[PDB]
Amino acid sequence: MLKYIIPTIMLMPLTWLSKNNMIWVNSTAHSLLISFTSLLLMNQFGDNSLNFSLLFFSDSLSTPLLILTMWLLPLMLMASQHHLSKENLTRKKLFITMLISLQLFLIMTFTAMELILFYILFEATLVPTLIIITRWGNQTERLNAGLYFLFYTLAGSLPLLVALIYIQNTVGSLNFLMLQYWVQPVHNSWSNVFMWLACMMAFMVKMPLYGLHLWLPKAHVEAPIAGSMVLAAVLLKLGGYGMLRITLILNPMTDFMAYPFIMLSLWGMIMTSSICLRQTDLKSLIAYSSVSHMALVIVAILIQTPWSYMGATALMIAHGLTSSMLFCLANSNYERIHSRTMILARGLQTLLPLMATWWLLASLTNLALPPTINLIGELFVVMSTFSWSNITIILMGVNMVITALYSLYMLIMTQRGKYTYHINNISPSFTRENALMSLHILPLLLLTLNPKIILGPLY
C-alpha cells in the first residue's frame, strides 16, 4: 500500500511548497492522479485476498472503499476552495493538510490486517475531522457539534479497545487472516454478551444506529462542505466496514444479539424517513436521509447472508456518492443565499436550469431508481431480509414509499413552484460547480454497467 501512502504524504509538501496562487490547482491535479492509480487495486482473485505485506491487505470489500476515498479528496478540494477564498494562505494550506491527513488515515484504516492497527487509524480519523468542523465551521454551535461527535465516538470506542486487547490475549493474534482460521464459536454467557457489545457499539455509533444518531445531524449542520462530504461518504462507512469484519468472530452469538439492533434499524429507517418530510434545514434533511439508508446497511450486516453482504457493500458505495452530491447541491444554493432553510429559495429551475438537472439525478438515485447501484444495493438487502422474515417486506416497502416522497419533496420545494421575489443574487452556475456535480453522478451511473466491482467479497 506504500504506492498509495507515500504519494498521499507527498501531497503535503506539494501544497506547502506551491506558489501561493497554485495551491488548489496543484493539490487537485495530483490528488486526481493518485485516484487514477487506485484502480490498480482491482486485481482481486476469486479465492484469496490481495495481501501485500504483514501490515496491509486489500480484498473486494476494502478496494471500492479505497477508490471512493481517493476519489473524494479532489472533489472536496474543488468544493472547498470558494468559501475559503478569503482565508489567509497559511490557513488554506493547513485546511488542505487536514484533508490530506484524513485520506492518509482512511486508506490505512481500510487496508490494515491487524485489528489494533485498524483501531488506531480508525480513531486517528477523529482528529482532522474534529479540527475541520470546529475550526472551519461558520456557526457558534460547531463547538458543541465537535464535542458530541468526539464523545459519542469515544463512549463506544474505548470498550472496543478493551475487547480487542482481550481477544488477542485469548486467541493470540488480531491479524484478520489469522482470525479467519483460528476463529472459535462464541458461547452464551454474560461475559460474551458484553464482549459482543464492546465489539459492536463503536461501529453502531458511527453508522449511526437509530437511537445513537443525533450527533450526525448536529455535525452536518455545523460542518463546512468538505467536512460533510467526507463524513457522509466515508466516515460513516468506517463503522459499516468495521462491523463487516468483526462479525466474523461473533458467531453464533450474533443470532440473538442482533435482534434489538435490527428492531432499532427496521423501525428507525421508517422514523428517520418520516422525519425528512418535516425537516426545514436542507443539510439536516440530508443528514436524516443518511440515517435511514444506513439502517438498511446495519440490518444487512447483522443478518449475515451472502446476498445481504453484497447489498451492504453496494449500498455503502452508492450512498457515499449520492449523499455527497446532495450536500454539494445544497451547498451551491447556500453559497448564493447564505441560508440552509429549504423553503427560503424556491423555483430555482426557472433560474438555474442545468443545476435543476443535477438535483433531479441526485434525487432519482436517492430514491433508488432501477438500475442505479442505489437500487441494486437496496434490492439485495430487501431480498435477503425477506428470507430472514417475510414480514420485513412491509417495513421495507413502506420505507421505499416515504423515501420517494421526501426525495421528490426536496426537489419540488427547492426547484419548482415560483421563485422567491426578493432573492435577486442567484447568479448563473459556475463551471466549477457543474463539474463537481458531474464528477459525482457520472461515475455513480457508470457503475450500473459493471456493478460486480462494488458487490464485495461475497460476489
Binding site: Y4, I6, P7, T8, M10, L14, N26, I34, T37
Partner: protein, 51 residues
C-alpha cells in the same frame, strides 16, 4: 525548473512507494515455489518462479 519542480513530488512518491512495495515481497519469499498448489520444477533459464 524552479517553476514546475514541485510537480515531480507526487510522481516520485509513487515510484518510491512502488519500489518499496516490491522490496517487501523480497522478504516474503519463504514459500516461493513451495506451496502444494503451485510448486513445480524450475525452467532451464529460471532462477526463481516469481520476484
Amino acid at each position: 525548473v524552479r517553476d514546475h519542480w514541485v510537480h515531480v513530488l507526487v510522481p516520485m512518491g509513487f515510484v518510491f512507494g512502488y519500489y518499496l512495495d516490491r522490496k517487501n515481497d523480497e522478504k516474503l519469499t519463504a514459500f516461493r515455489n513451495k506451496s502444494l498448489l503451485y510448486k513445480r520444477e524450475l525452467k532451464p533459464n529460471e532462477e526463481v518462479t516469481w520476484k
